[PDB]
Design a protein around this ligand. Structure first.
Ligand SMILES: Nc1ncnc2c1ncn2[C@@H]1O[C@H](COP(=O)(O)OP(=O)(O)O)[C@@H](O)[C@H]1O
Ligand SMILES: Nc1ncnc2c1ncn2[C@@H]1O[C@H](COP(=O)(O)OP(=O)(O)O)[C@@H](O)[C@H]1O
Ligand SMILES: Nc1ncnc2c1ncn2[C@@H]1O[C@H](COP(=O)(O)OP(=O)(O)O)[C@@H](O)[C@H]1O
Ligand SMILES: C[S@](=O)(CC[C@H](N)C(=O)O)=NP(=O)(O)O
Ligand SMILES: C[S@](=O)(CC[C@H](N)C(=O)O)=NP(=O)(O)O
Ligand SMILES: C[S@](=O)(CC[C@H](N)C(=O)O)=NP(=O)(O)O
Ligand SMILES: C[S@](=O)(CC[C@H](N)C(=O)O)=NP(=O)(O)O
Lengths: 442, 442, 442, 223
């Protein structure tokens, strides 16, 4: 671990000129603030505060002021404009102005739910994310246009992948930022891109996740493209969802690796599935917290629509990678990069770990393509259907009170509040699919 | 009633050059077929075949041939086809090859549930609608637009209102045709106008409805304008509702009249309220069948949001006009001019007179503004809420037995299938609302 | 008098075909509704109901429904709809669902405040108005631009006055709608037009005022010209003010002409001035009920700016024209055509009758040029300065609990309501004038 | 800004319905290497010289605004909802009040007024606030209560029971309050209060006489 004494030798050796003090509000939207190195020694004394009332979902105006205490192991110098003034950043968690951890800080909400796997004896909650994104041209006045960069397919090549050295430029800025990057490839739908990096422990992947979107949204705009993580920006082509690959660890042993059980899988792992597969209706308001992603959760675009699992199959809610061993993991296909990568782990760990204290006997793997089975056979197995909209997905969580509890209270309260606001916002609005279909006809 | 012999020689007296047999699909789309006075008999003798296969709501293509039997009492000439192409009109009911009348004919279903008030003593089922519409300008193309013939308000004057000379040439287009036009004027929302008339027998009022829709559609663009009966084409302005006044008649007496009361409303009337009010949540998917409809069903826009009633008050679902005389009526305002007239009367009768066959008791008339009630202050007075989406109001129809059987076995089967796939395109497409809200921020 | 029998009779004579039942809301905004001759008898029976809640200032929704009682003396055929659908108008009064009038009806309020002379003995209260209006060009698509039709001056000739045969035709439709037209001409500011008509009694001159604007607005937009009665649409030019020429009568004796006192004015005449002269600080929220009219009230454009009077002089708040006899009158110039004439009347009556039963020593004529006396010399006489804005006008009214009594309480409680939400609307807005002077300058 | 393509404005309210720009005024005095507001071991750590400074400004608030919000436009910012001080009051770590007390004290204790946009004349704003704020210590004035709730959510005549009145509504309204203030006037100068009260009245006059487009939009078509 890093101390306050080796941060002085990264401001002075690396010759940075600023430190960006970042964090994430409830909605998964990173917000940061920039200080001259002249103040470095004040932030590290934790004496730095902001307006809480304007961070969406934190605190009300009568007690606005709130504290910022930096995290030290998260230091990463910035490899873009570094001659102008080299930049640094330290991310962290927010305290209320009494030196108490804020309950609206999602990070702290993850570190609270992380202490519930030490009593159960687990040393790391590893996660590998695959945040799939799109790339759109920028118009003459730098305003993102409806045209995508390329018309490419899956795993395609020049001349049919215009973000070739564009993605390349992303991977390099990540490489400089201590990353260990797995693969770089175009994806199924036109303009769809994926860039794979190795898993880290729970809160360092969330860290390396919200870190990831900034490297792509700025660096794509140096190639003239606007990157987006909206789940289904285009109707009719593969939405871009952020697959969550998770594994539990126990003293250098992956607790999910046991080559005896039917699929070379362990018992703490089969148990973990049903931990999610019964409360999956619950958290698909957390893990899919946007009106748009309920357009991705519709069948046929290698996105999950029903609650089941299988080995190697890219139809169901859980897919078991044909590779195993230490790289053993459980892939959850419903999370999309419009989720909050902190609220996700707390909401999925508790949901998951709920199936180690009871373990609730997971079902049989639907080992077909689950897209094309009738309502007469979705019934036959008993596979729950996934929430139609956010309207339904919300009431399906205030009923799962193990998920409501992996959310604290503050974070739950401001959420069903906010997402019923957006959900009600959109239900009353007349957008022009209803004018075409009905105006000219009735 | 009209004769088969005084219509054949009703041509040589006005020189009628063509005849239009017309009927109604499952949606409210007045169909047609034009034929000369040449063929006058062959239609009168009900040997006018056609294809139900392509008409939405009728038989499949392996048994497609169907016949037209006119209802010779419905006879007018249009006052625009003058001496060149003088057009006659009837309205047909549908029958099979076996000449068994058709099992999905919407005008049969109403003609059929019209004698279920017969077996308990009622002369006529009175209906008088107040259908609002919106008026849009045109272009060089002679096609619709987004701007409305005037920016006006309730009752305003020319120049602030600009259909002033439109609706005049509209009404006295129906006035020739045989209507008792009560009022023409400009309703609340700009470009939205109301023309209403005196009540009529159930089939012959809704016979007179499809006349008013067509006639308004036609005389509108003769004056350069577009005539939409869309329920909610714009945001923030009053919807367009096809108001429902109705009343039951018995031996020269309005069965709702209570000659010398302080309520002037019989307990047979009072029972009809609970008749619908109870089944309200079940047949409103027929009172507002389009996905846009439910965006008009919201507070503030003089439109019912809650199942409740009050007197001389235009917030509650059922308004009680304080003019009674014989003109006594209960006015359900939860309809917009998209529902099928020959079937929202069936599915409003089959339920409302089940409030008398079962003799239920209507709740407290809540003579406050119902919108003003707190989220749960109206949870105490029991006034619950209308269905949210067409998806939610569709489930509620499939379950209600009362209105399901006042709808037909072939009409409910081929109406639930469409509105789900009509509801499904809506759920699966993405609308520009969402790139506006999600693209550049996630 | 005009009985219901002559008017049934009147119809079949001229071949009128529609009936227009009009009325004035709280603000001056003439509303109406159109019905055929077929319902003329449902009108005269006083059995036509309308919407109370969507007319501004009337009533709430919880008791929406209200009735319409025709006044049959106002009957005039609208001459501009020759032969096709002829029309004819009548000016109604409002009664509740209990056949009792509306305490908020602006016509019944004038009626009420008129009975206060019936007990102090006055036959008639004459009023002769001078509604000056502006004319603007139109666009190609029938939408009023900001150019004026002519750059003329006071009284100028063609062709320095494009609307010469606009006013000419304006006068003619009035000459067949029962008007005795006094004079036609051009006004001070370019594109301005004054057409005077001889006085009528209190509630007939108001009716003939509102009939004037319906006929100047309509006829002018038949000249490709938009007519406005804004008090000052342009800055820097003479506003348009609708002068009030009122006179009181006693037994064919104008109670103001008694050829003795200092200007052949009577005791009742001089006395009358006193009431308004002090009280004027309370009624220029009614007589000038619009922000744009306090831009009119600046000095130097023949508009009153301080409360004083003089003879033949156009500077002070009350001019007496040097003509007398039955031509004896008083002229208040504080009123602009942007006010409610009935409410203006109900307000200036109790504010002039109070100058009869106390009579309060009307001040001596300020026979100078009132714009050319400094603030030292305003304070010299003690001449009150007119209220600065609409906000300053409102609060200076609610202290006059005798002018609030000329309104009633339904009327007053709604008028201060709206003008407070409206005067609030402009106080908060950020309009172009402010960006100009402050953005590139600060 | 112009070296990097853009135009910079300090206009207090160049749009509608969004937060305005404002020159917060965090003030503190010093006494012989000492922060005159610090009471190292108080309950509020707020010296009874801080409180008397609080009263000083909060009493004269209504009348020295025309020196701190001199533009007609400044009063288009003094409205609720946009973190702008609308009523004369004070509380801690709360952004609704006129005077906000930020929680961190150390040696850096402050009471923060938020009713100044970067349009006022700082050389003269301080002269106004020292004069009339040390008028509450020299007069040992006692402050009104903290209202430690968000002030905008208080009823129309509610804040009258708790005694908190409101700030001037318009420049005219604010100017009268100054002309009737002698504490800040003599803390302002005789050549300055003379050339300043003649200067903003015409500037407020122009605003009053001219017709804005809002009046042609609203009233041309209907009226
Ligand atoms: N044992 C593991 N635990 C957690 N995450 C893992 C593990 N193995 C791989 N991952 C994650 O899987 C991601 C790679 O996904 P990808 O190659 O697209 O697999 P697939 O195509 O099968 O979905 C990497 O980002 C990595 O972090
Ligand atoms: N006895 C009755 N039965 C059915 N409908 C009636 C009866 N009496 C009046 N009506 C209807 O009331 C309606 C009145 O229209 P309108 O005056 O616009 O109503 P509203 O006051 O709700 O706007 C007419 O359409 C008429 O058909
Ligand atoms: N005795 C009277 N009572 C009421 N009004 C009168 C009387 N004599 C004249 N008037 C009014 O004076 C108006 C003439 O207006 P105008 O010629 O513009 O005079 P001025 O230029 O002084 O305003 C007429 O409209 C008429 O109604
Ligand atoms: C086959 S795909 O699986 C396409 C992903 C899809 N668009 C989705 O996320 O739903 N992605 P990957 O194999 O990299 O996990
Ligand atoms: C003034 S309104 O009252 C407006 C209600 C709205 N048009 C609706 O029914 O959606 N209806 P009506 O005048 O026909 O009674
Ligand atoms: C000379 S004027 O007097 C114009 C009045 C002024 N322009 C105004 O109303 O602002 N009107 P009139 O001669 O009819 O009395
Ligand atoms: C977040 S804000 O707190 C908003 C201030 C407000 N816009 C104003 O007008 O002063 N002010 P700051 O961060 O400068 O203390």
């Amino acid at each position: 671990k890093y101390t306050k004494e080796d941060i002085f030798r990264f401001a002075d050796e690396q010759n940075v000129k600023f430190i960006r003090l970042q964090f994430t509000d409830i909605l998964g939207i990173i917000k940061n603030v920039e200080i001259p190195v002249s103040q470095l020694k004040k932030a590290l004394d934790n004496k730095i505060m902001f307006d809480g009332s304007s961070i969406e979902g934190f605190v009300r105006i009568e007690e606005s002021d709130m504290y910022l205490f930096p995290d030290l192991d998260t230091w990463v110098v910035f490899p873009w404009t570094a001659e102008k003034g080299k930049v640094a950043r330290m991310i962290c968690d927010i305290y209320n102005p009494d030196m108490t951890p804020f309950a609206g800080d999602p990070r702290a909400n993850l570190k609270r739910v992380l202490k519930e796997m030490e009593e159960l004896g687990f040393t790391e909650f590893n996660l590998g994310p695959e945040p799939e994104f799109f790339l759109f041209k920028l118009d003459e006045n730098r305003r993102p246009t409806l045209e995508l960069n390329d018309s490419g397919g899956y795993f395609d090549l020049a001349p049919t992948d215009l973000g070739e050295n564009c993605r390349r430029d992303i991977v390099l800025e990540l490489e400089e930022m201590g990353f260990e990057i797995e693969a770089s490839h175009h994806e199924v739908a036109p303009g769809q891109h994926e860039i794979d990096f190795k898993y880290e422990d729970a809160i360092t992947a969330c860290d390396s996740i919200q870190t990831f979107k900034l490297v792509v949204k700025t660096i794509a705009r140096k190639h003239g493209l606007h990157a987006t993580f909206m789940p289904k920006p285009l109707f009719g082509v593969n939405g871009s969802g952020m697959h969550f690959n998770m594994s539990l660890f126990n003293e250098k042993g992956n607790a999910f690796f046991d080559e005896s059980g039917e699929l070379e899988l362990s018992q703490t792992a089969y148990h973990f599935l049903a931990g999610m597969l019964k409360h999956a209706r619950g958290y698909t308001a957390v893990t899919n917290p946007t009106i748009n992603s309920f357009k991705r959760l519709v069948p046929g675009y290698e996105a999950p629509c029903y609650i089941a699992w299988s080995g190697k199959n890219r139809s169901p809610l859980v897919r078991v990678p044909s590779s195993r061993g230490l790289s053993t993991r459980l892939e959850l296909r419903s999370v999309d990069p419009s989720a909050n990568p902190y609220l996700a782990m707390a909401v999925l760990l508790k949901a998951g770990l709920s199936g180690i204290k009871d373990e609730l006997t997971p079902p049989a793997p639907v080992d077909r393509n689950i897209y094309g089975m009738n309502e007469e056979e979705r019934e036959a197995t008993g596979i729950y259907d996934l929430p139609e909209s956010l309207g339904h997905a919300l009431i399906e969580l205030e009923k799962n009170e193990i998920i409501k509890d992996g959310l604290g209270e503050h974070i739950f309260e401001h959420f069903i509040e906010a997402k019923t606001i957006e959900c009600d916002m959109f239900r009353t609005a007349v957008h022009p699919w209803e004018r075409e279909q009905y105006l000219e006809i009735y």
